[model samples]
Target: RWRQTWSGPGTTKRFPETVLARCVKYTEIHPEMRHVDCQSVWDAFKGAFISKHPCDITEEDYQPLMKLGTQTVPCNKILLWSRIKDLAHQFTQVQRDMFTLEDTLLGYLADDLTWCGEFDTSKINYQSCPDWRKDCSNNPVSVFWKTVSRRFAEAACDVVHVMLDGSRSKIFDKDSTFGSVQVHNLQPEKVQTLEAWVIHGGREDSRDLCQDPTIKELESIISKRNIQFSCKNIYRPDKFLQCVKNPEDSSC
Candidate 1:
């Protein structure tokens, strides 16, 4: 019962700190997150993306897409939506750009786009956004596993699209690796796109629970990236929020 509001001593890092440590340790123990099966991750991710968006597709909508692969998209409406179509296009563009940059300046290593709680509104706001939101979550790095799962599912969809395009669309080449080769010349069947795009990293919410010392540590880590960012901290008096954990094991 004492675990409710109290850490029972040595829980000084705060509740989120405990949760974050556990979560990070979980992911670190399985950095690849390979133990988390791909299909289950796919379903949850599809639901999160489609559910979070303007569309209303649910588990019922996933049947047709499932016919295509071991795990299918729960929402076919995603294809029907013009925004998703363009977003897919943009994703391709960015992907290509990543490779191009890599070739010109060696493979670059930067963290994927991260999301935070403040950006969790039901709708998209163009003015303020991160570049890699499609594949990563703004959540604290602790619970990054959820974000990774979604990323894998989205990539799997791209793989299917790449396959279909190879047969009928003529929009791309089978040999194309980020628009570099022709599909007709290469064995499109052999090309294996991601069956999943999983993410395992930090949570955006952790910043709220981090002690001042920890917060300073986080700031130093992120400041190196040199990106303009902000946070939504509900608890004021800085130390106040850092000293407590949720009464129960539930959402932040």
Candidate 2:
């Protein structure tokens, strides 16, 4: 039995009781979550990798949880992202017209807190767990996100929203979760359009994606799957969020 915590870069803490209270409150306040049994969700979640080695836990472990929390994301509301998670999430939150995986029940629950276990004991490890580094590819945190992302992609329909970073030389890298897993998992029959919103980082941001060779490379990938593609360079200026907080700044 390993005496020390087996893995992680994220500081681990006791299963935050705040997560469960939030889950319960969601069921109480939101009509959609009202029917979901928080207890069952928590049980399935813990059972997924409770006794398994931290690094040995598989993505499939959460299949049951995914099934239990399945909800049809209304067509055109799916917001997938690559290299711009925080901005992407904030954009959706403020807009309210679109939804991302994090807006979903299962996504919010696990994401609200990090949980990992020890191989030796049946108890949910009271210690911290590994982050998504090479040594922890099979780690529960990454595996959970992978499974949930795949499931969300699978359920996506009609027009899909993809938020990308326009500053990255290669905005849509095949190695990214959106590029590798979600894009491949999207069904040709169900998805009608995949709209890519490349968020500009600065002066040269547009060229990084708008007319870049990689943009065509992106179209080629989606085109081969018979899914329609379009890219939009968002209203210029990264100050969109800045103005919300610092309206008195010179730019404002």
Candidate 3:
């Protein structure tokens, strides 16, 4: 009953305050967003999804938040990933020039965080927040990522690389963040090519994977989008060693 008034189980920061602090700090450090106001931006973000049913939020609901200004990565530096999130992170960490969606302001602030509001009480519902798997459309987390990822793809320019796990049954997932939103949003005019790096395990055989049906499907999507398409097997022992040691010069 009083759960809405109290900071419930999963609440990490005070409503608006923590987010505002994070936004301010992010802008301070990034320089690109120095003109952005933390309070104003957080208020707009709060107005978007707060006091609404968690399962009813839409991508459109996040439009105001998008107006807050997103940072842009340099040309040929963007990396998208489907099933190889950990390795993708590892790649970005070691490669100082590479940038992923998580490197953006929205992705940085929202990562590993959850929040929702209650209809009856008009208070932050920290205790029983909605799970992404339960209701993707209206869930706060899902809608946010969907909105952010769309922007990330739309901003992509020049050569872009997508890292997919060849070990998975399907290398590319049509419903993943990369497939469902990012690929669709990539601007054909701005982006020169979509490089698909299908990374299998260190010891796995990838002879047949270069021409696999899933890779073909990805190629088809990229072709339809008018972006030049190319695929490479990235986990062979020789190239894998290079990638592990220094990815900047590695073919993978």
Highest TM-score: give the candidate number: 2
Residue 97 local lDDT, model 1: 18
| Clashes (candidate 2) | 2
lDDT value, residue 176 of candidate 2 = 87
Which residue runs of candidate 1 sit more than 4 Å off their true CA positions? Answer: 1-211, 229-232, 236-252
Model 2, residue 206: displacement in angstroms? 5.4
Per-residue lDDT over 1-252 for candidate 2, one digit per residue giving the tens place of the 0 to 100 score: 454464454424646465566678767766776888777877787778788888888977887877778776676678899888788677666656678877788777776467777787877765567666646788878888888888888888999989888788787888889998999988899999899988887765335356778778888999899999999876564676666556688976
Worst 10 residues of 3 by lDDT: 2-11
Arranged by TM-score with the best first, the candidates are 2, 3, 1
What would the per-residue lDDT of candidate 3 be over residues 1-252, giving only the tens digit for each residue? 644432223445575677887787888888788888777788778877788877788888788888875566776789888988777777677655578876777876776677777665667776666665643456777788888888788878898988898888878889788888898999999999999888876465547576889889989989988999988877663466467666688355
Residue 97 shift from truth in candidate 3, angstroms: 2.3
C-alpha lDDT of all candidate models, in order = 0.26, 0.77, 0.77
* Candidate 3, position 21, lDDT: 78
Residue pairs in collision within model 3: 55-138
lDDT digits (tens) for residues 1-252 of candidate 1: 323221112212233233334333443444443244334433432333332422222333333323222222222111111112233333334333111111110011112222222223533222232222342232222133222223222322222222112111222222223222121122323323211111112333333322234233323433343322122233321232223332243432
By lDDT, is 1 or 3 better? 3
- List the candidate numbers ranked by lDDT, top first: 2, 3, 1
